[PDB]
Short mmCIF file of C-alpha atoms (C1' of nucleotides) in Angstrom, two decimals:
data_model
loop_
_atom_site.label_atom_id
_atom_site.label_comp_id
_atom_site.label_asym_id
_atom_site.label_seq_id
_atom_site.Cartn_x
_atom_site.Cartn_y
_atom_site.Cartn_z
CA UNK A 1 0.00 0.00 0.00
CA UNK A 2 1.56 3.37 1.10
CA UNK A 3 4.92 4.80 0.49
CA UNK A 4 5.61 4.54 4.19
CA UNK A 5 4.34 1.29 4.40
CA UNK A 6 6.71 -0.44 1.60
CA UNK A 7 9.42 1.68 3.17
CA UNK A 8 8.56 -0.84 6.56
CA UNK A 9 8.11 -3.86 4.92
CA UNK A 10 11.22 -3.58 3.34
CA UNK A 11 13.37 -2.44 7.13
CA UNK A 12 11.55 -5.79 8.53
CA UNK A 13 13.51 -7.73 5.66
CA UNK A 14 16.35 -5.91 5.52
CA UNK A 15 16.89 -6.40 9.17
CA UNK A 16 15.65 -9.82 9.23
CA UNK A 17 17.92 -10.68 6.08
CA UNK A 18 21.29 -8.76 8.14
CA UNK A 19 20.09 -10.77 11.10
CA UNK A 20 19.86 -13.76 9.33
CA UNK A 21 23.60 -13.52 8.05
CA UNK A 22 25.57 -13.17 11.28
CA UNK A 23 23.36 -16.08 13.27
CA UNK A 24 21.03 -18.25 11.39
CA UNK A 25 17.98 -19.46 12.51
CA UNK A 26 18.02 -19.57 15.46
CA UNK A 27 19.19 -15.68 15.62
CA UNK A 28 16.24 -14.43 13.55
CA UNK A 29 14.28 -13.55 17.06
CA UNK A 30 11.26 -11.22 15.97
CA UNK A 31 12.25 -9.34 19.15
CA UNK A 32 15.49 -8.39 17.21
CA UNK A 33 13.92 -8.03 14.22
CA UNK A 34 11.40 -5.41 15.36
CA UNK A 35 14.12 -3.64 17.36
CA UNK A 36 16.52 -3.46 14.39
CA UNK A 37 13.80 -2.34 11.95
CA UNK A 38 12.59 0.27 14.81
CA UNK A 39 9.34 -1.30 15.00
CA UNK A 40 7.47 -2.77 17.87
CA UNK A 41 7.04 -6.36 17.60
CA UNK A 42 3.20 -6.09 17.49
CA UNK A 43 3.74 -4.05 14.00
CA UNK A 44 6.32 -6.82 12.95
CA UNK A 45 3.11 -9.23 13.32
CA UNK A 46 0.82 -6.81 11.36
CA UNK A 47 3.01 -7.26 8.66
CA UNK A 48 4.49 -10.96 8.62
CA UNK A 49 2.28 -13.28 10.73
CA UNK A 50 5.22 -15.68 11.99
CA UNK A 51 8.79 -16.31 11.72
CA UNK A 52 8.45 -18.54 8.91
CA UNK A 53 6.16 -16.42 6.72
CA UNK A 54 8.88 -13.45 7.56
CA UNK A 55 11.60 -16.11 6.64
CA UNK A 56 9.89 -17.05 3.20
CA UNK A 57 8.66 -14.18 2.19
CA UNK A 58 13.03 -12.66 1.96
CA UNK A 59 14.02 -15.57 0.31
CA UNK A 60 10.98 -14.87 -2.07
CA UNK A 61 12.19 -11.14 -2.79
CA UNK A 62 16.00 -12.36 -3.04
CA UNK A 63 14.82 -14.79 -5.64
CA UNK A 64 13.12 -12.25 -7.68
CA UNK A 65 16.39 -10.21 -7.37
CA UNK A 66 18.35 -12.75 -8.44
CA UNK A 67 15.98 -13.64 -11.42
CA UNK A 68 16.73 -9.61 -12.55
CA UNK A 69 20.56 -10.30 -12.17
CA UNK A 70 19.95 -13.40 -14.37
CA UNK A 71 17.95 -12.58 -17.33
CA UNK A 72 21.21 -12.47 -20.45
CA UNK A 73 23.39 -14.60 -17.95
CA UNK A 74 20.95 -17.61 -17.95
CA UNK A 75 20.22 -17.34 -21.61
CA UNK A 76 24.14 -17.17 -22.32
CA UNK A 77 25.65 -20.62 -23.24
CA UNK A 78 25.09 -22.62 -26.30
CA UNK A 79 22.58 -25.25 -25.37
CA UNK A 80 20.19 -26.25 -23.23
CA UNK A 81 22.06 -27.91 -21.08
CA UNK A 82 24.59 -25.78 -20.90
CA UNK A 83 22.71 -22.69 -19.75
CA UNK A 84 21.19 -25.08 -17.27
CA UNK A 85 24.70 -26.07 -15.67
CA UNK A 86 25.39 -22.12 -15.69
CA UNK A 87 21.85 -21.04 -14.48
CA UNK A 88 22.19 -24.01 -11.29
CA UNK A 89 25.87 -23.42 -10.68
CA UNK A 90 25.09 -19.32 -10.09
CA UNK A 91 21.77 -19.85 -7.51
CA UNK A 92 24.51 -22.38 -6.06
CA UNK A 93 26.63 -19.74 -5.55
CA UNK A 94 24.75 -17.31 -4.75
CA UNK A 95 23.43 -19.78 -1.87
CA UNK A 96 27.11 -20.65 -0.66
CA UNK A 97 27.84 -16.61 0.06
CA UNK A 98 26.35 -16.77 3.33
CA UNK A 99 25.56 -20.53 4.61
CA UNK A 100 23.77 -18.47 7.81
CA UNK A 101 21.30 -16.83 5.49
CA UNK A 102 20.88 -19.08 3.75
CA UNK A 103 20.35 -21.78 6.47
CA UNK A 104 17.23 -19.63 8.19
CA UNK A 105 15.73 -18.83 4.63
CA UNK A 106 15.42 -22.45 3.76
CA UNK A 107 14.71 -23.95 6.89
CA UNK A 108 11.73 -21.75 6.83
CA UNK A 109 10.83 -22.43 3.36
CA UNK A 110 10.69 -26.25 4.48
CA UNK A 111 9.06 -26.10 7.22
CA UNK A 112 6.26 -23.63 6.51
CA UNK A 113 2.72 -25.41 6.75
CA UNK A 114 -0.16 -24.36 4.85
CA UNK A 115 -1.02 -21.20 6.17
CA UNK A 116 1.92 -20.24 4.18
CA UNK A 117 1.52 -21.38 0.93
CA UNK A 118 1.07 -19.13 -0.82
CA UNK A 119 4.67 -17.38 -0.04
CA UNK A 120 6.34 -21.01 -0.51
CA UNK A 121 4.26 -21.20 -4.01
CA UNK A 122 5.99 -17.86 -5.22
CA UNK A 123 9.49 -18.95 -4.52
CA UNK A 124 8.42 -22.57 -6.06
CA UNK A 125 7.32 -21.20 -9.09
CA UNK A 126 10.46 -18.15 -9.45
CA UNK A 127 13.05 -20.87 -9.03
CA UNK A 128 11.36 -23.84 -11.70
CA UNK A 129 10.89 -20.65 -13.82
CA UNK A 130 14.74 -19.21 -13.63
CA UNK A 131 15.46 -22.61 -14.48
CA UNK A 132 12.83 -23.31 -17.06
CA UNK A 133 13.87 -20.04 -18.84
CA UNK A 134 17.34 -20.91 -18.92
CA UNK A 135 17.06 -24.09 -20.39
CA UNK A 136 14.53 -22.83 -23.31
CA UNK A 137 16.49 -19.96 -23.87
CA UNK A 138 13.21 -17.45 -23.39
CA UNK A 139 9.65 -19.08 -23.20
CA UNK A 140 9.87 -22.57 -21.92
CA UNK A 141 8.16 -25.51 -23.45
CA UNK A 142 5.76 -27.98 -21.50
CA UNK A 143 8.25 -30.48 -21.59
CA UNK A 144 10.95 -27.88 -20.40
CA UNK A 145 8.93 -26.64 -17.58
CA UNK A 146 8.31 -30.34 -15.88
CA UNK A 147 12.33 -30.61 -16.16
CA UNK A 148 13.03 -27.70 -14.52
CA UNK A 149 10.52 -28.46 -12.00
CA UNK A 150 12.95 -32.10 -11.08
CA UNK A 151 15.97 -30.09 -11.09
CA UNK A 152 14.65 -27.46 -8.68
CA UNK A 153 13.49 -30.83 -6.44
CA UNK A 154 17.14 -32.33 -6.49
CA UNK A 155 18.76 -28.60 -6.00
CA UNK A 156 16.36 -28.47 -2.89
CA UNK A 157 17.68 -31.89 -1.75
CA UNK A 158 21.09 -31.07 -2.03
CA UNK A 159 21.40 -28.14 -0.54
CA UNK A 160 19.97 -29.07 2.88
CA UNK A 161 22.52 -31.88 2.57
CA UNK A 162 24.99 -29.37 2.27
CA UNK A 163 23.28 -27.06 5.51
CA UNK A 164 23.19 -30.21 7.60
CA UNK A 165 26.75 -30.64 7.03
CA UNK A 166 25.73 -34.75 5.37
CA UNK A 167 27.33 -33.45 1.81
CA UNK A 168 30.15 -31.35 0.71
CA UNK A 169 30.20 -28.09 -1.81
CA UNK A 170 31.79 -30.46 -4.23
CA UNK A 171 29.20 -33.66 -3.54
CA UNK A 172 26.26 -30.95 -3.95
CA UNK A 173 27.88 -30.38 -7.58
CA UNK A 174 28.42 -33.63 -8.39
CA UNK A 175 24.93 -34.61 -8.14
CA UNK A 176 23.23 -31.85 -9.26
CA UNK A 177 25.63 -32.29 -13.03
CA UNK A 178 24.20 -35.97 -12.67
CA UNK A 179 20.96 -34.80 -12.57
CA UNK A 180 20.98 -32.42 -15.74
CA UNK A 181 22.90 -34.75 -18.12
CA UNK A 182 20.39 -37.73 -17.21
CA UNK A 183 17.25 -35.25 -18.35
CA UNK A 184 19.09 -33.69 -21.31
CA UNK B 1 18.95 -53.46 28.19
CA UNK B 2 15.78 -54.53 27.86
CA UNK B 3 14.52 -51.83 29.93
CA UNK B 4 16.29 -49.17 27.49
CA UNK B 5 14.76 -50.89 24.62
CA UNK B 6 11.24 -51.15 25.81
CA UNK B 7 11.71 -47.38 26.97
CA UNK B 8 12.46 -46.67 23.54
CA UNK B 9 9.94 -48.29 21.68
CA UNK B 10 7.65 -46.77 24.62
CA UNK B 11 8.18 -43.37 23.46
CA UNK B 12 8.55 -43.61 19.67
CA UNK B 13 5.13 -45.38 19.94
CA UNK B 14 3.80 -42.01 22.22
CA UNK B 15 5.05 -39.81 19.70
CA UNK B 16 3.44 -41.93 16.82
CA UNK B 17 -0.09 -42.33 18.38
CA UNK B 18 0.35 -38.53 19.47
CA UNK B 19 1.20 -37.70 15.74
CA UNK B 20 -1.83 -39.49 14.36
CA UNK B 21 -4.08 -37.50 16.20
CA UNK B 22 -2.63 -34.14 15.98
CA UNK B 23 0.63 -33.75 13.91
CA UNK B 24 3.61 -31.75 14.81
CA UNK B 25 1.94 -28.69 16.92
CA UNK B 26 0.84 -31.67 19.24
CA UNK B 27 4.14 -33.74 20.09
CA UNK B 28 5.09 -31.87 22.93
CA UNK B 29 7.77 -33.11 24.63
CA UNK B 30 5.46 -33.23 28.25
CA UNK B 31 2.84 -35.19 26.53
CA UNK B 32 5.17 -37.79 24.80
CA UNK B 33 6.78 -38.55 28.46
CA UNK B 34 3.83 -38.36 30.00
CA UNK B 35 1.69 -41.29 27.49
CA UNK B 36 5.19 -43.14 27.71
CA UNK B 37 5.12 -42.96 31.71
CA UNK B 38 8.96 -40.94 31.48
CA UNK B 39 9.87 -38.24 33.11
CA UNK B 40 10.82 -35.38 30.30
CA UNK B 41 14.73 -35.47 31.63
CA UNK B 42 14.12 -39.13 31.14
CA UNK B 43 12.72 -38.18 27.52
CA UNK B 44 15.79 -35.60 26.67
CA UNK B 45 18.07 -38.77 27.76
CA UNK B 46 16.70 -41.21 24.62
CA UNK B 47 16.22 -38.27 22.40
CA UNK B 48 18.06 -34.84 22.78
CA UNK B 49 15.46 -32.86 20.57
CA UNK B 50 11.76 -32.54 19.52
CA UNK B 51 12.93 -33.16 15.98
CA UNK B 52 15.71 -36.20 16.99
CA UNK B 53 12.55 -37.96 18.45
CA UNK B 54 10.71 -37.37 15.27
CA UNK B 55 13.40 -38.19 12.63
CA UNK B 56 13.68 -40.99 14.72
CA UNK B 57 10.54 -42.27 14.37
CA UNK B 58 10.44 -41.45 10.88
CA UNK B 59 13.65 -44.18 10.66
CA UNK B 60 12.20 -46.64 12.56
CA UNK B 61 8.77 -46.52 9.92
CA UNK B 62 10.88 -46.53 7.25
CA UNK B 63 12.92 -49.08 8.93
CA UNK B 64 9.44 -51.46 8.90
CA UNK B 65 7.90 -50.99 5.65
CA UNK B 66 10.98 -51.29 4.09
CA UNK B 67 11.04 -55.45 5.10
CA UNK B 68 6.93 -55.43 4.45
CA UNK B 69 8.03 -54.73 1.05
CA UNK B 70 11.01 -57.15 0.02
CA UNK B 71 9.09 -59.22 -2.33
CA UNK B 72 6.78 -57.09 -3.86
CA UNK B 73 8.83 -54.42 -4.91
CA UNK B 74 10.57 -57.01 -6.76
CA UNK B 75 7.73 -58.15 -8.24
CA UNK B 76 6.86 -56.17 -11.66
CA UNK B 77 8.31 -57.32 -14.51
CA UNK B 78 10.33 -54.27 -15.79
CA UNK B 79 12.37 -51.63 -13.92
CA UNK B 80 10.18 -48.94 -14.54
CA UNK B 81 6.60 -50.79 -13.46
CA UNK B 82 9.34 -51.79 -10.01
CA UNK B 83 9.65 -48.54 -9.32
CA UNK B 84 6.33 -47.07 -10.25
CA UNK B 85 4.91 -49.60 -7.87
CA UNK B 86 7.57 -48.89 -4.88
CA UNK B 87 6.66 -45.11 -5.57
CA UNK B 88 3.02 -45.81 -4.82
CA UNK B 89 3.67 -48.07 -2.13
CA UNK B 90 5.12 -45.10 -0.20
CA UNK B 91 2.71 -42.75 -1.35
CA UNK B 92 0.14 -44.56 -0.21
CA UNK B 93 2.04 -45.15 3.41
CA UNK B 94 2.26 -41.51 4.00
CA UNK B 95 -1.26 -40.48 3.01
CA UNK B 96 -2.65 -43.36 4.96
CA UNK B 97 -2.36 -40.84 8.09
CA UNK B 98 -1.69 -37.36 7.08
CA UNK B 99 -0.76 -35.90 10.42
CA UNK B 100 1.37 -38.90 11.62
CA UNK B 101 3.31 -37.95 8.16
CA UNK B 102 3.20 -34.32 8.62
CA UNK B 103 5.18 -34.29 11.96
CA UNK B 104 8.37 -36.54 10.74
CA UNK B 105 8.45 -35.02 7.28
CA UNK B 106 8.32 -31.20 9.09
CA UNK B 107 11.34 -32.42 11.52
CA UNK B 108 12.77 -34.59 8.78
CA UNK B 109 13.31 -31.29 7.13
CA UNK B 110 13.80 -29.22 9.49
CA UNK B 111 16.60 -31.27 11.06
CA UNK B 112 19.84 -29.12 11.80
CA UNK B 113 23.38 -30.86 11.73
CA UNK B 114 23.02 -32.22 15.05
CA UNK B 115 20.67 -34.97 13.38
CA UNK B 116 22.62 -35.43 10.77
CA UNK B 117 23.04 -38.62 11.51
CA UNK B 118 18.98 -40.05 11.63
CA UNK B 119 17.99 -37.50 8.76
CA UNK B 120 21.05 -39.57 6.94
CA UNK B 121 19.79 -43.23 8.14
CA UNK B 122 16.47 -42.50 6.73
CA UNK B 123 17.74 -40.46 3.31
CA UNK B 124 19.27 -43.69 2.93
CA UNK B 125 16.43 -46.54 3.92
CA UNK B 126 14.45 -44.49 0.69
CA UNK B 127 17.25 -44.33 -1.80
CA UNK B 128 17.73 -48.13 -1.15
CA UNK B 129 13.95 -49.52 -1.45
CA UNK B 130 13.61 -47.06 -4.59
CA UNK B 131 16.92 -48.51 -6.07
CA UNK B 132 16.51 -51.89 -4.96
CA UNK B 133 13.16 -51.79 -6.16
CA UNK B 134 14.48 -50.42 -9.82
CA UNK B 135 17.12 -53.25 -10.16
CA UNK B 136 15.29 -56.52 -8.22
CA UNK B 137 18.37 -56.86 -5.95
CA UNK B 138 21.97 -54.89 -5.65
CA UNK B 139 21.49 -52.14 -7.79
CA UNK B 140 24.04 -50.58 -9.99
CA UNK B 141 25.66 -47.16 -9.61
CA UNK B 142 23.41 -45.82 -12.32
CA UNK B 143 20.07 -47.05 -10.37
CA UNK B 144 21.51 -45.54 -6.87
CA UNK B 145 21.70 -41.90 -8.72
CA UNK B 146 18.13 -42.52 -10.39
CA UNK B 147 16.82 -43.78 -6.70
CA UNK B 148 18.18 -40.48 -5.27
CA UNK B 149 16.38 -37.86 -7.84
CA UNK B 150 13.25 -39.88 -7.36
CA UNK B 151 13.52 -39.40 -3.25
CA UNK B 152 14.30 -36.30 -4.02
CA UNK B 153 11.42 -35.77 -6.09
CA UNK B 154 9.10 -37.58 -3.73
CA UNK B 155 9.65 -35.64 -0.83
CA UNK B 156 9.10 -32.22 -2.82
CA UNK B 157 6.26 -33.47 -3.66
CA UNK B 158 5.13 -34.82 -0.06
CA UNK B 159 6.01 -31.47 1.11
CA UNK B 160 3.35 -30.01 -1.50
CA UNK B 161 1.11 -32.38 -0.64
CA UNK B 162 1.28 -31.72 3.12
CA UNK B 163 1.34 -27.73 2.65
CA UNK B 164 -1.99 -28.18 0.30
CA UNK B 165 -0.10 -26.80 -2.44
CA UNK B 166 -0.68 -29.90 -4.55
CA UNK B 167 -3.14 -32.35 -4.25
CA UNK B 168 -3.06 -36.41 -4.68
CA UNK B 169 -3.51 -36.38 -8.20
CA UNK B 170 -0.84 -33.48 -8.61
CA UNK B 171 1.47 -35.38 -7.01
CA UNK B 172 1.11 -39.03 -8.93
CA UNK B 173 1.20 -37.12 -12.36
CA UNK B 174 4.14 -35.33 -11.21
CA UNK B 175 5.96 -38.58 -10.37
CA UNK B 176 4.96 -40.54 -13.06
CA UNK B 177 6.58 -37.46 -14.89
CA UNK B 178 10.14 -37.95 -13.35
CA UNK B 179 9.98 -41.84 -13.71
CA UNK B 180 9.60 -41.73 -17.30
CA UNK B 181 12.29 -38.86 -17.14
CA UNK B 182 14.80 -41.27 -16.30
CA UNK B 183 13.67 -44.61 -17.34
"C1'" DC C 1 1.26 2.65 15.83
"C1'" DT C 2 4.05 2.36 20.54
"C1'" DA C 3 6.21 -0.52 24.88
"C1'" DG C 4 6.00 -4.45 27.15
"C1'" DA C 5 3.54 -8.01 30.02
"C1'" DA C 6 1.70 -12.54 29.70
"C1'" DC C 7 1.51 -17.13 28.11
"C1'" DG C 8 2.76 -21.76 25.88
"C1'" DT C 9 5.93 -25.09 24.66
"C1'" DG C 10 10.93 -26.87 23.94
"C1'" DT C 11 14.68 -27.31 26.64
"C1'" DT C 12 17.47 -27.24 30.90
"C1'" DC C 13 17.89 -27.19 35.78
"C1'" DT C 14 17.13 -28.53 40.78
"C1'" DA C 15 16.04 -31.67 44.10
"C1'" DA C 16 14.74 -36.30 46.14
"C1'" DT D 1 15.22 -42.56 37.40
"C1'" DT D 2 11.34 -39.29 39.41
"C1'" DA D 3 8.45 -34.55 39.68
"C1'" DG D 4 8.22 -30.41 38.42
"C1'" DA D 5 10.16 -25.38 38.56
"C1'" DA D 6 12.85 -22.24 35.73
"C1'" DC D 7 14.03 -20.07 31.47
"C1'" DA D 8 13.97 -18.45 26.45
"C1'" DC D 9 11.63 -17.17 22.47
"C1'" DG D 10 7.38 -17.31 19.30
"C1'" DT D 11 3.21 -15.43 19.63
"C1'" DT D 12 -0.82 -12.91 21.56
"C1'" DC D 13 -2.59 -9.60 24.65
"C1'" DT D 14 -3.26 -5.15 27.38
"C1'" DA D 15 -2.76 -0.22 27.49
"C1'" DG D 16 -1.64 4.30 26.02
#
DNA sequence: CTAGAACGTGTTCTAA
DNA sequence: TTAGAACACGTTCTAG
């Protein structure tokens, strides 16, 4: 809604998203995370109605980012299954930067029930989408769409493997270069 | 001892009849010692966390289907109709009791690195029945890393499922999908 | 909106 | 082992 009111929402996930980076999880306390956006906690719940929701709705707007980041990029290599490779190996990345970020944002995203749906459906549908697109090269086919959907479901896999310390940077690669040559 | 293991299977069976009923908001940790006759220090000694005791009994289920289902899943005549089958198998397991499945899967995902070890177990239980199930018997590197996209798959999907965001047709079409995929 | 008190549940502590 | 009080943090409530 109002200019003001954007300006909030976007202090809650800054702060929440700064938070998130030095302490995980665990250290995204919405006591902090009103304090640091300099509002009271009861405004904090007017605008995200739990951790989680708070959680999944910035890894929804860093997804979107990173789709805008990605648009030439993505469509870049040669063949599909090259600009597949590139398009998984930069949201890998760009995961890896901050493990403690990432680790809250995901954990969240996993855990959310169904009174949060409809934030886990938007970062669902950006992330089979960056893929889809990447693959296509633009507009992606049925066929292309229902791939990307399996490689999203293996990336997902893999990378709370990785935040649970069971699989290594280099494991998480591995299989996810498995996974794209044996559906292209 | 005896006593440790009947303690055990004490509580996972709490948390499992507790689960049933009510799903993950309702396994609190006074509850479970309580229907298990434990004290909750007593509780914290078997399992350290909430989600340990639920990853836990996610294992243990896992655990007993997969020997329910040592001939059948080698049954079908061709890879593909093995693993279609083993697919549904589980599929059917989990929606049998939605809210006994919604607690373990929640934990089973939510699981930091201190469970690393029973989030592993059971990551591992799946992979093998899938693979197993593809090959009739020791399965060959190439049906372990077509077991593990299909778990992989199967939980994305549960977790759909479970959030509502997919229903039980949704799901079997989308499985179907990634078993043709691959095979 | 604000500042916090109050309350529930996971986890830890104290005491017998 | 037991019983249960204490404590922290997510969430809701009371007041201004």
């Amino acid at each position: 809604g109002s200019e003001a009111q954007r300006e909030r929402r976007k202090r809650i996930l800054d702060a929440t998203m700064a938070i998130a980076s030095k302490g995980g999880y665990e250290a995204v306390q919405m006591r902090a995370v009103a304090d640091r956006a300099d509002v009271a906690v009861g405004t904090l719940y007017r605008y995200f109605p739990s951790k989680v929701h708070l959680l999944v709705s910035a890894l929804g707007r860093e997804f979107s980012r990173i789709d805008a980041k990605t648009d030439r990029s993505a469509v870049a290599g040669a063949t599909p299954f090259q600009r597949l490779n590139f398009m998984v190996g930069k949201l890998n990345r760009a995961m890896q930067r901050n493990p403690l970020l990432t680790e809250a944002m995901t954990r969240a995203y996993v855990f959310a029930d169904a009174s949060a749906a409809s934030e886990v459906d938007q970062v669902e549908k950006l992330i089979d989408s960056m893929f889809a697109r990447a693959m296509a090269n633009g507009e992606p086919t049925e066929d292309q769409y229902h791939i990307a959907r399996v490689i999203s479901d293996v990336w997902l896999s893999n990378l709370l493997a990785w935040l649970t310390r069971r699989a290594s940077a280099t494991d998480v690669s591995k299989r996810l270069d498995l996974a794209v040559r044996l559906l292209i």
